[PDB]
Amino acid sequence: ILYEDQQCLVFRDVAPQAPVHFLVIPKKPIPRISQAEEEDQQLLGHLLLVAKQTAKAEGLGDGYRLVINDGKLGAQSVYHLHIHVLGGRQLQWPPG
Amino acid sequence: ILYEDQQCLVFRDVAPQAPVHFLVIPKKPIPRISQAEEEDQQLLGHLLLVAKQTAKAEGLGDGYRLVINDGKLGAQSVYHLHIHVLGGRQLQWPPG
């Protein structure tokens, strides 16, 4: 566990796709970004701020990519909201 | 222009990497996600909510991917914060 507070949990991905690959997830039951609502605004901003602070702690100062997958075409596997943070290698384009 | 308010602008990417590819950018001078601050929490959540509402308007109900690039290793080209939204095809894994 890299980081935890009352709103979120941050842990290493179990199938890492980069030398650093971690997940930022809310504790609140949001299944996917398409089903977030206006009441989630503050939490969503929090998750992004946690992602960028954890990226600093993991040594991603030369750059990184944040990814949120929605649904089948986004390749979302588990229907709970999660933000991927990938770094420690050159990320390519397109992003899948 | 897909969407605009006092806080953000949404427009099609000029080098699209999917059948739907648009950008959500803040009007505020944030250069990259690594340099966002606590005062940006509300705005960051807003940008994600705008992204997901615009994805619905663009017909991305079968899924999509949100991407934020930071720095050289993230393949960030222009140093102003922007969220990519890609859909309308199967997005692959890894995400670059």
Side-chain angles (χ1 to χ4, degrees), chain B residues 77-91:
Chain B
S77 184
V78 175
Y79 290 75
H80 184 73
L81 179 61
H82 51 282
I83 307 182
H84 295 262
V85 185
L86 297 93
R89 67 172 171 83
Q90 182 65 62
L91 280 292

Side-chain angles (χ1 to χ4, degrees), chain A residues 7 15 17 21 32-38 40-46 48-49 52 56 60-75 84 86 88-96, chain B residues 7 15 17 21 32-38 40-46 48-49 52 56 60-75 84 86 88-96:
Chain A
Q7 298 172 250
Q17 305 293 304
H21 183 178
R32 56 202 294 197
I33 193 62
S34 60
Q35 294 175 180
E37 292 309 335
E38 281 213 348
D40 300 317
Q41 180 177 351
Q42 172 171 240
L43 172 62
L44 294 170
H46 184 67
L48 288 174
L49 289 171
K52 72 94 183 173
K56 290 179 178 172
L60 310 186
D62 291 335
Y64 59 87
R65 181 169 290 158
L66 306 179
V67 179
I68 304 174
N69 294 336
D70 184 274
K72 168 177 112 259
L73 298 181
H84 295 262
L86 297 93
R89 67 172 171 83
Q90 182 65 62
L91 280 292
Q92 302 297 318
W93 200 247
Chain B
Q7 298 172 250
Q17 305 293 304
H21 183 178
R32 56 202 294 197
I33 193 62
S34 60
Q35 294 175 180
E37 292 309 335
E38 281 213 348
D40 300 317
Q41 180 177 351
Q42 172 171 240
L43 172 62
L44 294 170
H46 184 67
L48 288 174
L49 289 171
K52 72 94 183 173
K56 290 179 178 172
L60 310 186
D62 291 335
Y64 59 87
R65 181 169 290 158
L66 306 179
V67 179
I68 304 174
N69 294 336
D70 184 274
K72 168 177 112 259
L73 298 181
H84 295 262
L86 297 93
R89 67 172 171 83
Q90 182 65 62
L91 280 292
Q92 302 297 318
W93 200 247

Side-chain angles (χ1 to χ4, degrees), chain B residues 18-39:
Chain B
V20 174
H21 183 178
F22 63 88
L23 300 176
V24 180
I25 73 172
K27 290 177 171 181
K28 191 173 193 274
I30 304 167
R32 56 202 294 197
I33 193 62
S34 60
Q35 294 175 180
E37 292 309 335
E38 281 213 348
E39 67 178 85

Side-chain angles (χ1 to χ4, degrees), chain A residues 2-14:
Chain A
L2 301 188
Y3 176 90
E4 182 175 3
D5 64 25
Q6 291 192 357
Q7 298 172 250
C8 73
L9 179 66
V10 183
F11 61 95
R12 293 192 190 290
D13 192 277
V14 294

